[PDB]
Write an enzyme that holds these catalytic residues in place. Structure first.
Site, PDB file in Angstrom:
ATOM      1  N   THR A 239      63.770  30.995  59.202  1.00 10.59           N
ATOM      2  CA  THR A 239      62.772  31.724  58.416  1.00 10.59           C
ATOM      3  C   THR A 239      62.809  33.207  58.826  1.00 10.59           C
ATOM      4  O   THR A 239      62.776  34.096  57.969  1.00 10.59           O
ATOM      5  CB  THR A 239      61.351  31.150  58.646  1.00 10.59           C
ATOM      6  OG1 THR A 239      61.355  29.744  58.365  1.00 10.59           O
ATOM      7  CG2 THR A 239      60.341  31.827  57.727  1.00 10.59           C
ATOM      8  N   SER A 282      58.249  30.402  54.170  1.00  8.86           N
ATOM      9  CA  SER A 282      57.910  29.066  54.680  1.00  8.86           C
ATOM     10  C   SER A 282      56.721  28.645  53.816  1.00  8.86           C
ATOM     11  O   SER A 282      55.572  28.933  54.147  1.00  8.86           O
ATOM     12  CB  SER A 282      57.492  29.116  56.153  1.00  8.86           C
ATOM     13  OG  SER A 282      57.002  27.849  56.569  1.00  8.86           O
ATOM     14  N   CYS A 348      51.024  29.246  62.653  1.00  5.14           N
ATOM     15  CA  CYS A 348      52.232  29.540  63.420  1.00  5.14           C
ATOM     16  C   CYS A 348      51.994  30.005  64.850  1.00  5.14           C
ATOM     17  O   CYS A 348      51.342  31.018  65.090  1.00  5.14           O
ATOM     18  CB  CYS A 348      53.099  30.568  62.698  1.00  5.14           C
ATOM     19  SG  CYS A 348      54.738  30.739  63.479  1.00  5.14           S
ATOM     20  N   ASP A 389      63.291  27.155  49.912  1.00  5.04           N
ATOM     21  CA  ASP A 389      62.409  28.263  50.270  1.00  5.04           C
ATOM     22  C   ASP A 389      63.195  29.555  50.012  1.00  5.04           C
ATOM     23  O   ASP A 389      64.432  29.568  50.095  1.00  5.04           O
ATOM     24  CB  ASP A 389      62.039  28.188  51.756  1.00  5.04           C
ATOM     25  CG  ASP A 389      60.815  27.312  52.024  1.00  5.04           C
ATOM     26  OD1 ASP A 389      59.750  27.528  51.406  1.00  5.04           O
ATOM     27  OD2 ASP A 389      60.917  26.404  52.873  1.00  5.04           O
TER      28      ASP A 389
HETATM   29  C1  HEM Z   1      58.574  35.345  59.824  1.00 10.07           C
HETATM   30  C2  HEM Z   1      58.821  34.103  60.430  1.00 10.07           C
HETATM   31  C3  HEM Z   1      57.950  32.998  60.452  1.00 10.07           C
HETATM   32  C4  HEM Z   1      57.166  32.523  59.428  1.00 10.07           C
HETATM   33  C5  HEM Z   1      57.017  33.161  58.040  1.00 10.07           C
HETATM   34  C6  HEM Z   1      56.511  31.320  59.931  1.00 10.07           C
HETATM   35  C7  HEM Z   1      55.633  30.547  59.186  1.00 10.07           C
HETATM   36  C8  HEM Z   1      55.037  29.371  59.656  1.00 10.07           C
HETATM   37  C9  HEM Z   1      54.122  28.540  58.849  1.00 10.07           C
HETATM   38  C10 HEM Z   1      53.729  28.707  57.387  1.00 10.07           C
HETATM   39  C11 HEM Z   1      53.738  27.544  59.672  1.00 10.07           C
HETATM   40  C12 HEM Z   1      52.756  26.455  59.308  1.00 10.07           C
HETATM   41  C13 HEM Z   1      51.430  26.758  59.976  1.00 10.07           C
HETATM   42  C14 HEM Z   1      50.334  25.812  59.526  1.00 10.07           C
HETATM   43  O1  HEM Z   1      50.500  24.589  59.720  1.00 10.07           O
HETATM   44  O2  HEM Z   1      49.310  26.289  58.976  1.00 10.07           O
HETATM   45  C15 HEM Z   1      54.394  27.713  60.973  1.00 10.07           C
HETATM   46  C16 HEM Z   1      54.301  26.807  62.034  1.00 10.07           C
HETATM   47  C17 HEM Z   1      55.055  26.864  63.215  1.00 10.07           C
HETATM   48  N1  HEM Z   1      55.965  27.867  63.518  1.00 10.07           N
HETATM   49 FE1  HEM Z   1      56.412  29.457  62.410  1.00 10.07          FE
HETATM   50  N2  HEM Z   1      56.919  31.031  61.255  1.00 10.07           N
HETATM   51  C18 HEM Z   1      57.775  32.075  61.591  1.00 10.07           C
HETATM   52  C19 HEM Z   1      58.403  32.235  62.837  1.00 10.07           C
HETATM   53  C20 HEM Z   1      58.295  31.353  63.915  1.00 10.07           C
HETATM   54  C21 HEM Z   1      59.045  31.476  65.165  1.00 10.07           C
HETATM   55  C22 HEM Z   1      59.848  32.704  65.597  1.00 10.07           C
HETATM   56  C23 HEM Z   1      58.826  30.310  65.884  1.00 10.07           C
HETATM   57  C24 HEM Z   1      59.395  29.886  67.097  1.00 10.07           C
HETATM   58  C25 HEM Z   1      59.298  30.567  68.303  1.00 10.07           C
HETATM   59  C26 HEM Z   1      57.898  29.521  65.083  1.00 10.07           C
HETATM   60  C27 HEM Z   1      57.361  28.295  65.502  1.00 10.07           C
HETATM   61  C28 HEM Z   1      56.472  27.519  64.769  1.00 10.07           C
HETATM   62  C29 HEM Z   1      55.878  26.282  65.252  1.00 10.07           C
HETATM   63  C30 HEM Z   1      56.168  25.577  66.574  1.00 10.07           C
HETATM   64  C31 HEM Z   1      54.993  25.877  64.292  1.00 10.07           C
HETATM   65  C32 HEM Z   1      54.038  24.694  64.370  1.00 10.07           C
HETATM   66  C33 HEM Z   1      52.699  25.115  64.955  1.00 10.07           C
HETATM   67  C34 HEM Z   1      51.690  23.984  64.973  1.00 10.07           C
HETATM   68  O3  HEM Z   1      51.764  23.101  64.093  1.00 10.07           O
HETATM   69  O4  HEM Z   1      50.826  23.978  65.862  1.00 10.07           O
HETATM   70  N3  HEM Z   1      57.585  30.156  63.874  1.00 10.07           N
HETATM   71  N4  HEM Z   1      55.219  28.823  60.946  1.00 10.07           N
END
Ligand code: HEM
Length: 399
Positions: A239, A282, A348, A389
């Site tokens: 992403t 995403s 996130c 996506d």
């Molecule tokens: C611009 C980049 C990114 C976008 C647009 C993005 C977007 C998202 C979205 C929409 C979710 C869902 C949150 C929800 O359930 O409401 C999410 C969850 C998550 N993202 Fe990202 N993310 C990005 C970058 C990252 C990066 C760099 C990491 C890793 C280090 C990451 C790790 C995670 C994890 C582990 C979850 C699950 C969190 C949970 O359910 O507690 N994300 N992200």
């Protein structure tokens, strides 16, 4: 009931269905690949409701959970990590790795993020383009997030290039199922060795913290540590790569905005805010199953029914964001949070890190390459398949 996921109206645009649904049927049923039904939520207020309701569950073993693909249904069988947990398990595991991602920790990480970006830019520059344009994704957008998360997890510098390549194979549209799974198992195998190593001689990285604070005390076992580390790696990397590429394409698309950013890199933060709202890379991660009957709008969602809340649609909700389909880095922001990173407890974990990476990229890229230009007609840009996506596969540039 229309089939879901919908297809993007075009390379850089969201599915045309959302605008129509927000206006005439904000909460409706769609049909999934297996014929099952699910409720699709399209309005910002409703998406926020789904993201925080305690009557909804993220557990994928619940009948009714909206799996969108054949592979999705298969993965749902593995032991779950915090991404698929409900309270209290969710925060119990998530808080194990949250420290590294706090706003404070990310602020202290800024100089490292900057040097990483600076070095990659220098390598892309000395890599020149004298004999032609270069692929900004391969040379920059892919390695930036990859090197950073791998480094944070604990991967040594010399293994970064190879590991970045393998992780990319996981999600490359060109990879066969075999190559994708092979790369997958390989990364898992590699992390297993890292955990064994760090259990003996801990260093300053995420894997070490997990080993020392959770594995040694007996809070989780080694395989757990491996899966948590793997989740952090694969969750948002692809992403991030797409967001960086999408950012460059958008600036090319809107010369006026690029001019303003070049003239004032201080606008990087607001450019990133608009980018994460406009390009919701995403958009299929906010899914639930109703634990009990719940009313949303004029619809009753019964116990055991699935729900998909489109943060991409919410980010174009004209009732919250004026002229939602217009990309405007100078946009006047409403009190409502754009939802590119989700909402609620599951929001996130790396939102601040992600924004810091993007901000660093867009406050530096055109400083290094003032004349950076997409070396192909914007209308020819190679976007991800319309049924996926939004994102960009490759982006030839000259500078
Ligand atoms: C611009 C980049 C990114 C976008 C647009 C993005 C977007 C998202 C979205 C929409 C979710 C869902 C949150 C929800 O359930 O409401 C999410 C969850 C998550 N993202 Fe990202 N993310 C990005 C970058 C990252 C990066 C760099 C990491 C890793 C280090 C990451 C790790 C995670 C994890 C582990 C979850 C699950 C969190 C949970 O359910 O507690 N994300 N992200």
């Amino acid at each position: 009931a229309p089939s879901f996921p919908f297809s993007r109206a075009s390379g850089p645009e969201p599915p045309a269905e959302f605008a129509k649904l927000r206006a005439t049927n904000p909460v409706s049923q769609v049909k999934l690949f297996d014929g099952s039904l699910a409720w699709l939520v399209t309005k910002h207020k409703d998406v926020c409701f789904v993201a925080t309701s305690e009557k909804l569950s993220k557990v994928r073993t619940r009948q009714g959970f909206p799996e969108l693909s054949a592979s999705g249904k298969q993965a749902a069988k593995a032991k779950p990590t915090f991404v698929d947990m409900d309270p209290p398990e969710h925060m119990h595991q998530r808080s194990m790795v949250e420290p590294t991602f706090t706003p404070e920790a990310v602020k202290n990480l800024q100089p490292y993020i900057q040097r990483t970006v600076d070095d990659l830019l220098e390598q892309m520059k000395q890599k020149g383009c004298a004999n032609g344009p270069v692929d900004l994704v391969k040379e920059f957008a892919l390695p930036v997030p990859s090197y950073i998360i791998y480094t944070l997890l604990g991967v040594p510098f010399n293994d970064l290039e190879y590991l970045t390549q393998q992780n990319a194979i996981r999600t490359n549209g060109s990879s066969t199922a075999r190559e994708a799974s092979a790369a997958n198992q390989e990364l898992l195998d590699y992390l297993a060795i890292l955990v064994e190593q760090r259990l003996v001689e801990p260093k300053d990285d995420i894997i070490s913290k997990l080993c020392t604070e959770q594995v040694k005390p007996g809070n989780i076992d080694k395989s757990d540590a491996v899966q948590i580390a793997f989740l952090l790696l694969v969750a948002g990397n692809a992403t991030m790569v797409n967001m960086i590429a999408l950012g460059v394409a958008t600036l090319a698309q809107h010369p006026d905005q690029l001019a303003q950013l070049k003239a004032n890199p201080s606008l990087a933060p607001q450019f990133v805010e608009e980018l994460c709202r406009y390009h919701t890379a995403s958009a299929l991660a906010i899914k639930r199953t109703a634990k009990e009957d719940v009313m949303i709008g004029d619809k009753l969602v019964r116990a055991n029914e699935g729900i998909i809340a489109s943060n991409q649609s919410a980010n174009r909700d004209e009732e919250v964001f004026e002229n939602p389909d217009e990309f405007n880095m100078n946009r006047k922001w409403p009190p409502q949070d754009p939802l590119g990173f989700g909402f609620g407890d599951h929001r996130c974990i790396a939102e601040h890190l992600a924004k810091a990476e993007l901000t660093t990229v867009f406050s530096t890229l055109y400083q290094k390459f003032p004349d950076l230009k997409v070396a192909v007609p914007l209308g020819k840009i190679n976007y991800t398949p319309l049924n996926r996506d939004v994102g960009i596969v490759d982006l030839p540039v000259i500078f």
